[PDB]
């Protein structure tokens, strides 16, 4: 191979990790096509913080399109040519500006007192409760309203149906005859649903409707001379997806992990009580002064990253960190392994949120849950925001205990996420 001479072996993240430990800051593995990864700081800040290297299309192929139906597509996340990804990037910036974001607290409050009052409704210590089902259909509800302006209803148990169509969909990611079809007809179904949601914008705006400025919006502008509506859709889906999915499992990782840290816990209690006290309602500016929610969140992403990583195309042969690398040849970057490796972390399996306290010296390329640079995510401080609120309501009202049984382990599909559906019984505080 043109890969033989490069150090390697003569949960798949965690079979990266032995390797890395294994054999050093530049390995080769097999994803899907030959790759290799790279976990020295320095490559990560040389790769990532360049508009010279580009994402590797090859890699995204398995999210552009699955058994042939198209999934991301050219949207936001999947589209690797530079100027394409650059024009509605900018565009679509607009719906995540700072009174973009901050005119959301609303949505954010709603959906997640409807969370807690459920919760509240069920707290008796016994009946068991999925939070990662009940914090997905959170995130869901607060999506579909946040960036959409619908209301999916699915904390009411609306929306089974498309419900059943997202998770048909992830499981094909990383895939007889039969699931072969409840996968295409999956993917159909989300994309039908998004030529659904843009004809009624389209009727709102014909008939001159009030029409927030949302993430909806901005995606119809970044399309205004395609002779189809196969770009819209790509972002439609991309949105819709990224949008919801790693959210929720950021907040049921967060969730399992605490069941397990009660001195955390009540620390967590005591800001909460501090800053917002009994009011129902968190301002954006309490956002602020919850500075140990946000560094559990952090330490949270550190052990936990739904999006495990990212790669770029290397063009042409480099040496990297001593290490002969082809021209072209698939750069894996992962903050999964980074997060776990005692070379960059002390105890790496220590969950301890002051490696996030200020005055904690920061991570320096060795922590990047939302990746960094040019394509970094566009929803970081959406995600930030509606987490903190979530999390902060749920500490202020109510108790959480694992059932016993409940595994802490993980499943990969393109993303991670708990391998059980985090089922606690619930007490009111
Ligand atoms: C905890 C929540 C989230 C995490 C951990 C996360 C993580 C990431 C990561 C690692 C990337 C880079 C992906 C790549 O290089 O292939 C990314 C990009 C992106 N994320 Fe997120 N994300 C989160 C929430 C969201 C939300 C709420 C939205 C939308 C409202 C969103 C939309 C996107 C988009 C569109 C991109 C591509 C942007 C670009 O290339 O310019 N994500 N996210
Ligand atoms: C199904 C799904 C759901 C959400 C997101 C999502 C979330 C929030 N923001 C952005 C995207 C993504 C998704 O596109 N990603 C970026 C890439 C990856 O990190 C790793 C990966 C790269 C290539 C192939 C497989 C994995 C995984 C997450 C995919």
Not at 10 to 33: M, S, T
Not at 187 to 196: E, K, N, P, T, Y
Not at 281 to 305: A, C, H, I, M, N
């Amino acid at each position: 191979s043109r890969y033989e001479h490069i150090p390697g072996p003569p949960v798949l993240q965690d079979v990266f990790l032995d390797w890395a430990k294994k054999y050093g800051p530049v390995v080769r593995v097999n994803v899907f096509k030959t790759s290799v990864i790279v976990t020295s700081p320095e490559s990560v800040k040389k790769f990532l913080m360049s508009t010279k290297y580009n994402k590797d299309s090859k890699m995204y192929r398995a999210l552009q399109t699955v058994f042939g139906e198209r999934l991301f597509g050219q949207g936001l996340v999947s589209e690797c040519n530079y100027e394409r990804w650059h024009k509605q990037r900018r565009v679509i910036d607009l719906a995540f500006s700072r009174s973009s974001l901050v005119s959301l607290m609303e949505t954010f409050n709603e959906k997640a007192e409807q969370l807690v009052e459920i919760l509240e409704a069920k707290a008796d210590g016994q009946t068991p409760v999925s939070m990662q089902d009940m914090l997905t259909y959170t995130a869901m509800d607060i999506l579909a309203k946040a960036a959409f302006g619908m209301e999916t209803s699915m904390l009411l148990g609306a929306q089974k149906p498309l419900s059943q169509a997202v998770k048909l969909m992830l499981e094909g990611i990383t895939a007889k005859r039969k699931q072969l079809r409840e996968v295409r007809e999956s993917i159909r179904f989300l994309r039908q649903v998004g030529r659904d949601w843009v004809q009624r914008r389209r009727e709102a705006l014909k008939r001159g409707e009030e029409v927030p400025a949302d993430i909806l919006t901005q995606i119809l502008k970044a399309e205004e001379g395609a002779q189809d509506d196969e770009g819209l859709l790509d972002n439609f889906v991309t949105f819709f997806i990224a949008g919801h999915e790693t959210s929720a499992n950021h907040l049921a990782f967060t969730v399992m992990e605490l069941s397990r840290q009660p001195e955390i816990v009540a620390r967590l209690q005591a800001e909460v009580d501090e800053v917002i006290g009994s009011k129902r309602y968190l301002d954006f500016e309490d956002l602020g002064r919850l500075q140990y929610l946000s560094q559990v969140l952090k330490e949270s992403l550190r052990l936990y990253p739904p999006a495990w990583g990212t790669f770029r195309l290397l063009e042409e042969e480099t040496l990297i960190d001593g290490v002969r690398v082809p021209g072209n040849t698939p750069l894996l970057f992962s903050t999964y392994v980074m997060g776990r490796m005692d070379t960059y972390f002390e105890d790496p399996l220590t969950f301890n949120p002051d490696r996030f306290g200020p005055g904690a010296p920061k991570p320096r390329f060795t922590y990047f849950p939302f990746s960094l640079g040019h394509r970094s995510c566009i929803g970081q401080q959406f995600a930030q925001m509606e987490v903190k609120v979530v999390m902060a309501k749920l500490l202020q009202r109510l108790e959480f205990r694992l059932v016993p049984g409940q595994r802490f382990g993980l499943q990969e599909q393109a993303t991670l996420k708990p391998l059980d559906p985090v089922l606690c019984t619930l007490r009111p505080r």
